Amino acid sequence: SAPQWFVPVKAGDAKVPAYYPTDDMIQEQKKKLRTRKGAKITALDKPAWNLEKLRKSIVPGAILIIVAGKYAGKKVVFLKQCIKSGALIVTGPFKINGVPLMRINQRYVIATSQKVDVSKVDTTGVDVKFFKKIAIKKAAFGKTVEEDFAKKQYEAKKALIVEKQKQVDESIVAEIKKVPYLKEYMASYFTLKNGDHPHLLKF
Amino acid sequence: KCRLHVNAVFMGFQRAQRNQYPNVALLQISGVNTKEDTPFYIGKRVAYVYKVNVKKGSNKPAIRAIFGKIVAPHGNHGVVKARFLHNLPPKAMGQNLKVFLYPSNI
Amino acid sequence: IKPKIVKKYTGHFKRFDSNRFLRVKASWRVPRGIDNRLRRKFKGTNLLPKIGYGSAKATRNMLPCGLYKFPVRNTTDLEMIMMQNRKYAAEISHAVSAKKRQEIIQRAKILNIRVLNADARIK
Amino acid sequence: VKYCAKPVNVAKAAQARGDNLKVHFKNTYETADAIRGMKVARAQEFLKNVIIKKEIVPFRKHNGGVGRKAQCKGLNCAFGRWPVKSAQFILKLLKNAVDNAKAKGLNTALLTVSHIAVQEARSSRRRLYRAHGSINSFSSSPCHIELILTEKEKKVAK
RNA sequence: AAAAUGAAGACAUUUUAACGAGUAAGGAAACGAAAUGGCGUAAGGACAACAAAAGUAGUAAAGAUUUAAAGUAAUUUAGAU
RNA sequence: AUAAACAUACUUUGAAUCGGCCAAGUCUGGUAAGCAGGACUGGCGAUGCGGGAUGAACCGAACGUCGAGAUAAAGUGCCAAA
RNA sequence: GGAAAACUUAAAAGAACUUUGGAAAAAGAGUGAAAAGAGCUUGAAAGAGUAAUAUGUGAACGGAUAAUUUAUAAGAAAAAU
């Protein structure tokens, strides 16, 4: 039949050779560009093969200064590591820092010694399903235009799920106020004043 | 708002008496005075954040950068070597860079 | 699929002493003079075309599109690369008129052959 | 011989030119250089004053041996002359180009000299009998002068 | 250089190793595993839509001015005027 | 003892050349020469590069296009990398 | 003793009337497929003029590396069970 190198195409009422199959017996094929298979989705309780090895200075309930990204210089409390990605699930309790519950890579943080401890945080949710549910997606390529208001209406519809998952932060704020000067230390920023050299600072 | 970098001076490129190899740029990080205090900084990101005046009828930003890393010490005075994605312009010699605190290992 | 076409020198090897005089053209001619600043390879002026500059064999004579060049004069030349439309790209010669070009361009669509002169001699 | 530059709009332009005019090129190139841009009402007055030697024509480029003059203050030039035969030849084009505009129906109070260029023509050679039985050349330097007067209106750029 | 494969693929094949500066001077053409590889100008004999109208050209040749691509290089190809 | 198979032995034809110059834990004539003439060897000639600030010969070291590293001569107050 | 000098177009249809000017000429107008306009096929380089862009303390130009500006330039498919 058709050789492996032949892909017939239609002709718009133009001259064709004697050996070329006519248009009445030609069916068009869809151009295929994607070949690599995607990522297999597995159970929510099994860690991925591609899992970062946490530093020994990072333990749950610690206070991590963040030195890069949108929230630079803010201090957050590390709950647990997101298994499906390896990025830390930290929360700079929104009642204090203004830092929401997000994911961040382990190389952007500095682990201080002020361990908030706090067990019984009730992180039954906040798996990878929640984080993918609130991420603001794009408008794709063919979905009309929907310029601007698509992302504005995106955030509004995701507001409720974010607020509901703030039952994580109600308990943590309780023991932040317990230690004196720990609410002020957390609320403010992190700055490198004159005379503090990075190779000399110890946290 | 806050400071999360130490200003390193762009001294120049790794050279000889009558040569110049612009692939590697030397820095004199503020506060570092010996090669024994450099073991910390080997790896930390460095950016050459500069400013370009632009007309209102263009799209390009007015603040750009050239990011790089610190790769090895140099000399016994704490001078380091930095390799950038694009070699720093020789117009930046003597100016100040940024030495960030990530990828952190603390 | 396209291998990275790597170039060991992206400039032109201009003739020595062609930036001062106009009778000396910018086409390379190796200097044979005894005291020449360039044939001795003095520092600062030591640029000569040596076979080490030759580009990779796999990606030699390859256009940036990833396809080699194949010039066609008529519609019947297109059939010579109708089996290799993934390796060769037609390029209609510069003498072919503006009427025979629409025969080649349309036929190259039927056989699905990329043409580098699809906007040449248009009305 | 064709014009160096074509007018932006041919309904607002009047043209005049002279071919192989018998006047020095190094002199007219500097007289046509001063009057480029100024209104045709003022360019006619300036060329009337160079003749009677009350305005200077600064020799900006061909200034070798040209003496200093008192009217060359402010022009960034310390040299200047009063070419009378070169002014009289341009003055007979500005009168030709102005009277071409009246034929079309333009407004003479607005005309400006937008483009005026001087070229190099074909010289005519003579003999100058030198010492030791040698003969040299004695050749003129004629030039082609072009001219385009365009009505001046306030431009718009949104 | 040595092995392997070899009627036509192709990029003057595949694998391994050693090597590459140079004035005077030498290495003509052909030689399948090629006893160096090529570019350019002009002229002559052939080949150039293989189903009985068979290279390009008034739907714009040669030439000139530039712009891009290929080649390390001699140079080639293409777009526009 | 050690090295030697792209080892060894060559054959035919032929081009260029026979104005040379420098160094020295050497010599001769000369008061002496950046002089004249030699014996063994290395170079410049024919040769760039790093160093001696510059230098045909000195010291390191001989070159296809590159990237990363330890180096050689030699240096680390500034010009100038240390 | 002893040179230089070829070419408008298919055809002269080789501008034909007005305005400015002493005349040559210029601007309209017109012929012609196209001014190819008699210096007449296209028309390079040296040398110039006009426009646009950019630069600067006793030479200029070239090469390596970046920065700024301008130009060229890369796609229509699509996940897991």
Curated annotation (Swiss-Prot), chain A:
Subunit structure: Component of the large ribosomal subunit.
Known function: Component of the large ribosomal subunit. The ribosome is a large ribonucleoprotein complex responsible for the synthesis of proteins in the cell.
Annotated source species: Entamoeba histolytica (strain ATCC 30459 / HM-1:IMSS / ABRM)
Chief location: cytoplasm
Entry protein name: Large ribosomal subunit protein eL6
Keyword Oxidoreductase: no
Compartments in which it is found: Cytoplasm, Cytosol; Cytoplasm; Endoplasmic reticulum
GO terms of molecular function: RNA binding; structural constituent of ribosome
Superkingdom of origin: Eukaryota
Alphabetized UniProt keyword annotations: Cytoplasm, Endoplasmic reticulum, Ribonucleoprotein, Ribosomal protein
GO cellular component: cytosolic large ribosomal subunit; endoplasmic reticulum
Family: Belongs to the eukaryotic ribosomal protein eL6 family.
GO BP, one annotated term: cytoplasmic translation
